[PDB]
């Protein structure tokens, strides 16, 4: 279960 | 209202002029910018991009710039010694891209169409005529704090060099995170710094198999070199003390400059409080920010000063 840096 | 009476009444001191960068303190230069002069400048919302700008207003040593062709809602204020503006023609002489006016390139043709005057060259502190920062070349790589998400230290590149400053870009992100700095910025470090420090390095956006990112491989695959370690200089912490007073541009109405206090301090940052206002309005600012000034700056430069609320 991956956590991803999102900027939108 | 006067500073003297106010300091007497509050039993307070102003931050000595010596505490500031020369550029923040200087009051003896006149503002030579005039209404309608045209020039080139960085978009503060996109610091890698250059636009044609027109002088919309002048107040003391400050000026309000308008993006030709775009809405006046994007107008912004700079000081007359800003290094983020350049004379007409600077882009082509120096290898920079100039965005044209909205919808619209040749300056001679545009000046003929508009019957406007370009701001004269002598007004500009930055014309790419001074010795660049040694060791910082376009294309080189480093590690940089994302100043907007400062828990992150990230893979970064130098993408522009202008006089004493260079532009730091976050690989694979947009330019909204970019910032201009110099070799002593506390926000930059050599390739390998995070590894030395036992700190996680944030790799480029969408880098395949990011947990296995390796600088050695990244540099090889990008044909890039690291900024040499000797090029990074240690900036001393500033010497502002809590309760010291000064002047500061209001971020909520940038036209205004207010009587201010040092509320709190870090090594390189200062928490500003507007005397008389709610602490809700307090904000952190880097000590080198062009929008803080010693007491007396407004009065000496011919800009109104808002006294405490
Ligand atoms: Cl617009």
From Swiss-Prot, chain B:
MBT repeats lie at residues 1-101, 105-204, 213-308. This is Lethal(3)malignant brain tumor-like protein 1. The chain holds residues 274 to 586 of 840 of the full protein. Ubiquitinated in a VCP/p97-dependent way following DNA damage, leading to its removal from DNA damage sites, promoting accessibility of H4K20me2 mark for DNA repair protein TP53BP1, which is then recruited to DNA damage sites. Polycomb group (PcG) protein that specifically recognizes and binds mono- and dimethyllysine residues on target proteins, thereby acting as a 'reader' of a network of post-translational modifications. PcG proteins maintain the transcriptionally repressive state of genes: acts as a chromatin compaction factor by recognizing and binding mono- and dimethylated histone H1b/H1-4 at 'Lys-26' (H1bK26me1 and H1bK26me2) and histone H4 at 'Lys-20' (H4K20me1 and H4K20me2), leading to condense chromatin and repress transcription. The record marks 146 as: Mediates recognition of monomethylated and dimethylated peptides. It comes from Homo sapiens. The L3MBTL1 locus is imprinted. Paternal inherited gene is expressed, while the maternal inherited gene is silenced. Widely expressed. Expression is reduced in colorectal cancer cell line SW480 and promyelocytic leukemia cell line HL-60. The record marks 149 as: Positioned at the entrance of MBT 2 and is required for recognition of monomethylated and dimethylated peptides. Residues 170-177 are annotated as: Interaction with monomethylated and dimethylated peptides. Changing residue 146 to N: Strongly impairs binding to monomethylated and dimethylated peptides. Abolishes binding to p53/TP53 monomethylated at 'Lys-382'. The MBT repeat 2 specifically recognizes and binds monomethylated and dimethylated proteins. In contrast, it does not bind trimethylated proteins. The MBT repeat 1 does not bind methylated peptides but inserts a proline ring in a Pro-Ser-Ser/Thr sequence context. It is found in: Nucleus. Homodimer. Interacts with RB1/RB (when monomethylated at 'Lys-860'). Interacts with p53/TP53 (when monomethylated at 'Lys-382'). Interacts with CBX3, ETV6, KMT5A and VCP/p97.
